[PDB]
Paper text:
To this end, we crystallized the D86V mutant. Consequently, the clinical D86V mutation of [name] PYD apparently does not affect its three-dimensional structure in comparison to the wild-type protein. We should note that despite a large variation of chemical space, all wild-type and D86V crystals belonged to the hexagonal space group P63 with four molecules per asymmetric unit, resembling a dimer of dimers. The charge-bridging system is similarly broken as in the wild-type protein, suggesting that this mutant could undergo the conformational switching necessary for dimerization. Indeed, the D86V mutant showed a very similar dimerization tendency to that observed for the wild-type protein. Remarkably, however, the D86V mutant revealed a higher tendency towards aggregation, as indicated by the pronounced void peak. While the engineered L84R mutant showed remarkable properties such as a drastically improved thermal stability that correlates with a strictly monomeric six-α-helix structure, the naturally occurring D86V mutant behaved very much like the wild-type protein despite its severe physiological implications. This suggested that the mechanistic basis for the physiological role of the D86V mutation should relate to its interaction with other relevant components rather than an intrinsic change within the pyrin-domain structure. By contrast, the negative charge is significantly reduced in this potential interface of the D86V mutant. Still, we emphasize that the proposed docking model merely serves to illustrate a possible mechanism for how the D86V mutation can severely affect the interaction of [name] PYD with other binding partner molecules, even if ASC should turn out not to be the physiological binding partner of [name] PYD.
Author numbering:
A (entry chain B): 8 to 99
B (entry chain A): 6 to 93
Write the structure that this text describes.
């Protein structure tokens, strides 16, 4: 159980302003069918340390690992999608 | 239903990847298939073209399995990039 305590915080800290917001949105979407928009208020304004503990709360154990890995996946696809969107059509 | 990712989604994103990104994708796939398929189909994947690669995932991971595995691989791929960034 190394991921919830130390791993997530390091990579989260590596994210810039745009990337961090992107993370929260996908998390919001992920928590939606299970918790609704109830914790979204907390998550949206949450700091990285608070965000890490929040995920430990709603997703304890390897649950944090499963959702986080998937969120990082969607984040990569977003960048790729945004990149492909300009190649497919040069008019954005 | 839905999640027709190998047929419509996956094929596009693989094409967005460069050579190194495609290889990195294959490596992570190898890691995932190992406890399930071993190194038996790894030979096929290693040499696989992007179009071939999509059908292979359609084969070994039918239904929404292809989307789930792909999403996790892209996650590790992103973590790799982030790791390399902090290391620099």
């Amino acid at each position: 159980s190394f991921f919830p305590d130390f791993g997530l915080l390091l990579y989260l800290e590596e994210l810039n302003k745009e990337e961090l917001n992107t993370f929260k949105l996908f998390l919001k979407e992920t928590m939606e069918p299970e918790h609704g928009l109830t914790p979204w208020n907390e998550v949206k304004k949450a700091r990285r340390e608070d965000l890490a503990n929040l995920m430990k709360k709603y997703y304890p154990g390897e649950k944090a690992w499963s959702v986080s890995l998937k969120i990082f996946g969607k984040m990569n696809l977003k960048v790729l999608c945004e990149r492909a969107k300009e190649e497919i059509n040069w008019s954005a």
